[PDB]
Tab-separated table of C-alpha atoms in Angstrom:
chain	number	residue	atom	x	y	z
A	2	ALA	CA	96.094	111.630	69.736
A	3	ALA	CA	93.797	114.545	70.480
A	4	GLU	CA	90.904	112.243	71.507
A	5	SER	CA	93.068	110.122	73.835
A	6	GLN	CA	94.720	113.198	75.341
A	7	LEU	CA	91.294	114.713	75.964
A	8	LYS	CA	90.324	111.542	77.848
A	9	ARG	CA	93.523	111.609	79.879
A	10	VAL	CA	93.026	115.264	80.764
A	11	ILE	CA	89.450	114.678	81.851
A	12	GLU	CA	90.217	111.595	83.872
A	13	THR	CA	93.123	113.319	85.621
A	14	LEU	CA	91.311	116.593	86.356
A	15	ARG	CA	88.408	114.456	87.741
A	16	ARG	CA	90.783	113.823	90.671
A	17	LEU	CA	90.098	117.464	91.740
A	18	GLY	CA	86.749	118.744	93.022
A	19	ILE	CA	85.228	122.174	92.301
A	20	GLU	CA	85.574	122.985	96.071
A	21	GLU	CA	89.360	122.472	95.825
A	22	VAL	CA	89.476	124.846	92.834
A	23	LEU	CA	87.520	127.512	94.672
A	24	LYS	CA	89.997	127.217	97.520
A	25	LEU	CA	92.918	127.646	95.120
A	26	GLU	CA	91.421	130.855	93.814
A	27	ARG	CA	92.088	132.526	97.144
A	28	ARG	CA	95.810	131.959	96.521
A	29	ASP	CA	95.745	133.605	93.053
A	30	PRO	CA	97.630	136.918	93.172
A	31	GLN	CA	94.760	138.295	91.024
A	32	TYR	CA	92.302	137.379	93.814
A	33	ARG	CA	94.530	138.862	96.481
A	34	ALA	CA	94.933	142.188	94.687
A	35	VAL	CA	91.202	142.410	93.967
A	36	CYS	CA	90.361	141.538	97.550
A	37	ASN	CA	92.731	144.122	98.972
A	38	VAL	CA	91.101	146.797	96.803
A	39	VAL	CA	87.554	145.649	97.692
A	40	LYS	CA	88.402	145.650	101.383
A	41	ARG	CA	89.806	149.162	101.085
A	42	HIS	CA	87.109	150.684	98.851
A	43	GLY	CA	84.011	148.547	99.333
A	44	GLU	CA	82.199	146.351	96.890
A	45	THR	CA	80.905	148.896	94.431
A	46	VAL	CA	84.041	151.015	93.949
A	47	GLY	CA	86.370	148.037	94.337
A	48	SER	CA	84.501	145.926	91.803
A	49	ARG	CA	84.523	148.798	89.315
A	50	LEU	CA	88.264	149.327	89.742
A	51	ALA	CA	88.933	145.606	89.340
A	52	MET	CA	86.663	145.468	86.277
A	53	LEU	CA	88.438	148.380	84.594
A	54	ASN	CA	91.817	146.801	85.346
A	55	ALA	CA	90.674	143.515	83.845
A	56	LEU	CA	89.345	145.260	80.726
A	57	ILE	CA	92.787	146.673	80.014
A	58	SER	CA	94.753	143.520	80.947
A	59	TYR	CA	96.104	142.921	77.425
A	60	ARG	CA	99.408	143.565	75.617
A	61	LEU	CA	101.280	143.438	78.892
A	62	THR	CA	104.615	142.107	77.489
A	63	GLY	CA	104.668	139.216	79.936
A	64	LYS	CA	103.968	141.296	83.047
A	65	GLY	CA	100.398	140.258	83.952
A	66	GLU	CA	101.294	139.103	87.451
A	67	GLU	CA	103.258	142.275	88.263
A	68	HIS	CA	100.454	144.360	86.789
A	69	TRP	CA	97.850	142.865	89.188
A	70	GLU	CA	100.212	143.218	92.145
A	71	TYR	CA	100.768	146.877	91.193
A	72	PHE	CA	97.003	147.441	90.835
A	73	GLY	CA	96.377	146.091	94.324
A	74	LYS	CA	99.158	148.143	95.918
A	75	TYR	CA	98.203	151.301	94.045
A	76	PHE	CA	94.552	151.400	94.999
A	77	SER	CA	94.756	149.708	98.446
A	78	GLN	CA	96.750	152.727	99.730
A	79	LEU	CA	95.021	155.592	97.941
A	80	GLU	CA	91.733	157.385	98.462
A	81	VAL	CA	89.476	157.196	95.376
A	82	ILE	CA	87.079	160.074	94.740
A	83	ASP	CA	86.222	160.340	90.992
A	84	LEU	CA	86.620	156.797	90.001
A	85	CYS	CA	86.931	157.341	86.243
A	86	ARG	CA	89.455	160.149	86.582
A	87	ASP	CA	91.456	158.236	89.177
A	88	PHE	CA	91.536	155.155	86.950
A	89	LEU	CA	92.660	157.076	83.909
A	90	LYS	CA	95.465	158.637	85.975
A	91	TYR	CA	96.469	155.116	87.111
A	92	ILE	CA	96.673	153.995	83.467
A	93	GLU	CA	99.067	156.857	82.753
A	94	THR	CA	101.205	156.058	85.800
A	95	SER	CA	101.507	152.294	85.607
A	96	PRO	CA	104.870	150.916	84.473
A	97	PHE	CA	102.994	148.028	82.935
A	98	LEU	CA	100.467	149.769	80.662
A	99	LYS	CA	102.747	151.809	78.389
A	100	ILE	CA	102.008	149.921	75.132
A	101	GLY	CA	98.921	151.448	73.520
A	102	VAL	CA	98.246	153.644	76.518
A	103	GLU	CA	95.844	155.985	74.658
A	104	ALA	CA	93.623	153.105	73.504
A	105	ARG	CA	93.618	151.670	77.050
A	106	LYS	CA	92.342	155.039	78.269
A	107	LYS	CA	89.670	155.060	75.571
A	108	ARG	CA	88.453	151.572	76.485
A	109	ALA	CA	88.361	152.387	80.163
A	110	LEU	CA	86.470	155.542	79.315
A	111	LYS	CA	83.770	153.528	77.518
A	112	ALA	CA	83.235	151.505	80.708
A	113	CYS	CA	84.001	154.242	83.222
A	114	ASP	CA	80.449	154.744	84.516
A	115	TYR	CA	79.283	151.179	84.145
A	116	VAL	CA	78.400	149.425	87.367
A	117	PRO	CA	78.609	145.624	86.985
A	118	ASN	CA	75.877	143.406	88.401
A	119	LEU	CA	77.751	140.894	90.457
A	120	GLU	CA	74.646	138.707	90.902
A	121	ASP	CA	73.901	138.544	87.171
A	122	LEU	CA	77.227	137.903	85.511
A	123	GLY	CA	75.570	136.770	82.280
A	124	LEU	CA	73.785	140.087	81.847
A	125	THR	CA	76.986	141.850	82.890
A	126	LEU	CA	78.912	139.969	80.194
A	127	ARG	CA	76.296	140.928	77.569
A	128	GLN	CA	76.422	144.558	78.654
A	129	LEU	CA	80.215	144.623	78.624
A	130	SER	CA	80.221	143.167	75.103
A	131	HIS	CA	78.215	146.190	73.951
A	132	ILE	CA	80.286	148.667	75.927
A	133	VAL	CA	83.718	147.402	74.853
A	134	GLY	CA	82.673	146.222	71.430
A	135	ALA	CA	83.786	142.587	71.473
A	136	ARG	CA	82.329	139.132	71.231
A	137	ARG	CA	81.131	137.758	74.549
A	138	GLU	CA	83.699	134.952	74.284
A	139	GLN	CA	86.660	137.310	73.805
A	140	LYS	CA	89.495	136.799	76.290
A	141	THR	CA	89.396	140.076	78.046
A	142	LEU	CA	85.611	139.955	78.575
A	143	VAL	CA	85.460	136.421	79.998
A	144	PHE	CA	88.539	137.221	82.133
A	145	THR	CA	86.688	140.277	83.441
A	146	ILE	CA	83.839	138.027	84.542
A	147	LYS	CA	86.299	135.869	86.480
A	148	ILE	CA	87.733	138.987	88.171
A	149	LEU	CA	84.226	140.171	89.026
A	150	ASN	CA	83.546	136.791	90.658
A	151	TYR	CA	86.699	137.252	92.712
A	152	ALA	CA	85.398	140.674	93.825
A	153	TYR	CA	82.004	139.172	94.758
A	154	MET	CA	83.488	136.236	96.675
A	155	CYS	CA	85.797	138.515	98.593
A	156	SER	CA	83.170	141.121	99.358
A	157	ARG	CA	80.444	138.714	100.468
A	158	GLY	CA	82.638	135.998	101.988
A	159	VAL	CA	81.132	133.254	99.866
A	160	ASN	CA	81.971	130.704	97.251
A	161	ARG	CA	80.119	131.003	93.986
A	162	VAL	CA	80.639	128.647	91.075
A	163	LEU	CA	80.576	130.303	87.656
A	164	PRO	CA	78.328	129.172	84.815
A	165	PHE	CA	79.323	126.463	82.378
A	166	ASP	CA	78.247	128.659	79.473
A	167	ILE	CA	80.999	131.286	79.912
A	168	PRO	CA	84.093	129.921	78.163
A	169	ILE	CA	87.759	129.948	79.125
A	170	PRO	CA	89.884	133.088	78.393
A	171	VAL	CA	92.145	132.115	75.554
A	172	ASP	CA	95.409	134.061	75.506
A	173	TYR	CA	98.648	132.810	73.936
A	174	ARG	CA	99.533	131.072	77.206
A	175	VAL	CA	96.306	129.058	77.302
A	176	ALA	CA	96.789	128.238	73.613
A	177	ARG	CA	100.309	127.042	74.364
A	178	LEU	CA	99.117	124.874	77.275
A	179	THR	CA	96.389	123.349	75.149
A	180	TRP	CA	99.003	122.464	72.520
A	181	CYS	CA	101.474	121.221	75.171
A	182	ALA	CA	98.825	118.787	76.453
A	183	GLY	CA	98.318	117.402	72.938
A	184	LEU	CA	94.692	118.550	72.806
A	185	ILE	CA	95.139	120.363	69.476
A	186	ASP	CA	97.328	119.414	66.522
A	187	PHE	CA	97.575	122.963	65.174
A	188	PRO	CA	100.124	125.355	66.636
A	189	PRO	CA	99.462	127.900	69.402
A	190	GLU	CA	99.476	130.878	67.048
A	191	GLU	CA	96.744	129.308	64.930
A	192	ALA	CA	94.876	128.206	68.075
A	193	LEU	CA	94.900	131.756	69.368
A	194	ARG	CA	93.369	132.931	66.081
A	195	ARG	CA	90.830	130.070	66.281
A	196	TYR	CA	90.181	130.660	69.950
A	197	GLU	CA	86.670	129.271	69.820
A	198	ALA	CA	88.082	125.875	68.915
A	199	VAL	CA	90.231	126.041	72.047
A	200	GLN	CA	87.190	127.054	74.064
A	201	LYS	CA	85.234	124.074	72.746
A	202	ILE	CA	87.911	121.677	74.007
A	203	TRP	CA	87.860	123.159	77.483
A	204	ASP	CA	84.043	123.172	77.429
A	205	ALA	CA	84.186	119.360	76.896
A	206	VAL	CA	86.639	119.111	79.789
A	207	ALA	CA	84.358	121.284	81.909
A	208	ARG	CA	81.263	119.233	81.256
A	209	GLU	CA	82.964	115.947	81.997
A	210	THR	CA	84.825	117.136	85.125
A	211	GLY	CA	82.178	119.373	86.672
A	212	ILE	CA	84.636	122.303	86.680
A	213	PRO	CA	83.321	125.281	84.692
A	214	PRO	CA	85.702	126.901	82.197
A	215	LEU	CA	86.479	130.000	84.226
A	216	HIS	CA	87.512	127.700	87.096
A	217	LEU	CA	89.559	125.502	84.754
A	218	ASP	CA	91.359	128.798	84.039
A	219	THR	CA	92.607	128.728	87.660
A	220	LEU	CA	94.089	125.288	87.158
A	221	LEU	CA	95.749	126.371	83.925
A	222	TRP	CA	97.292	129.353	85.676
A	223	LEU	CA	98.910	127.068	88.274
A	224	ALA	CA	99.947	124.455	85.746
A	225	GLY	CA	101.386	127.127	83.493
A	226	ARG	CA	103.474	128.620	86.262
A	227	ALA	CA	105.012	125.180	86.831
A	228	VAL	CA	105.427	123.958	83.291
A	229	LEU	CA	106.207	127.108	81.311
A	230	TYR	CA	107.908	129.217	83.970
A	231	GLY	CA	109.379	126.704	86.415
A	232	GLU	CA	107.462	128.101	89.451
A	233	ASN	CA	105.875	125.153	91.258
A	234	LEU	CA	103.454	126.558	93.778
A	235	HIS	CA	102.071	123.131	94.734
A	236	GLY	CA	98.531	124.245	93.950
A	237	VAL	CA	98.085	121.416	91.460
A	238	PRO	CA	99.589	118.007	91.944
A	239	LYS	CA	102.341	116.392	89.985
A	240	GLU	CA	99.961	114.454	87.722
A	241	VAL	CA	98.189	117.621	86.640
A	242	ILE	CA	101.469	119.335	85.807
A	243	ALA	CA	102.504	116.288	83.809
A	244	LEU	CA	99.432	116.635	81.535
A	245	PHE	CA	100.950	119.766	80.067
A	246	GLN	CA	104.319	118.172	79.347
A	247	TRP	CA	103.104	115.817	76.613
A	248	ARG	CA	104.901	117.644	73.816
A	249	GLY	CA	108.744	117.679	73.739
A	250	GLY	CA	109.848	121.251	74.761
A	251	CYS	CA	106.976	121.864	77.149
A	252	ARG	CA	109.383	122.020	80.050
A	253	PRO	CA	110.739	124.969	82.156
A	254	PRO	CA	114.238	126.333	81.260
């Protein structure tokens, strides 16, 4: 089943080009928040704020979307002076960051002075892995690279396709979608533990479709909104949504 589902996924996602994915990224509320902050604060400060927000985008109790919207509103309308201090204050203030707030502050503090290199995202990922103390493939780090690409694209007014060798950010949602598409036969909880196995599947999809993993992430966001949450944004077509409804209860309420 897993082999035939992988083929179906590839041959369906082949109907979409990388240029269409890049266009969809402009619609992502994460992109919009980042871009609003970069326009307000410039590339260097805005990219650092977006980076720090991405680094602490975990244990959000289902509020990731609201959290990015709040980030964008908070910093788009506020002067930033001492970036580290201002970020730490934001962590304390946010309605969305209350779980483990002290450890969020400590992680942000580790990265507070770090200036990402937006034109060498591979070196940036390696540096972040040392700063944060995580494997390069860990969800929050690869997600941070995606967010940094959003900041770069917005700042420079360009498209830039991410590397194939940076894997997809595997959170419980992505694990659930992978299971819902019949690509794994072990449950989402186990998949999340074994997140590299999930990444390997999406790396095969990436290679065969021409859509790098961090861009496949965009498609999974849209498909997930439709299938898990019942919010059809019409960013992906009906046949893409249907991929993720292979298993019985993979349906909106």
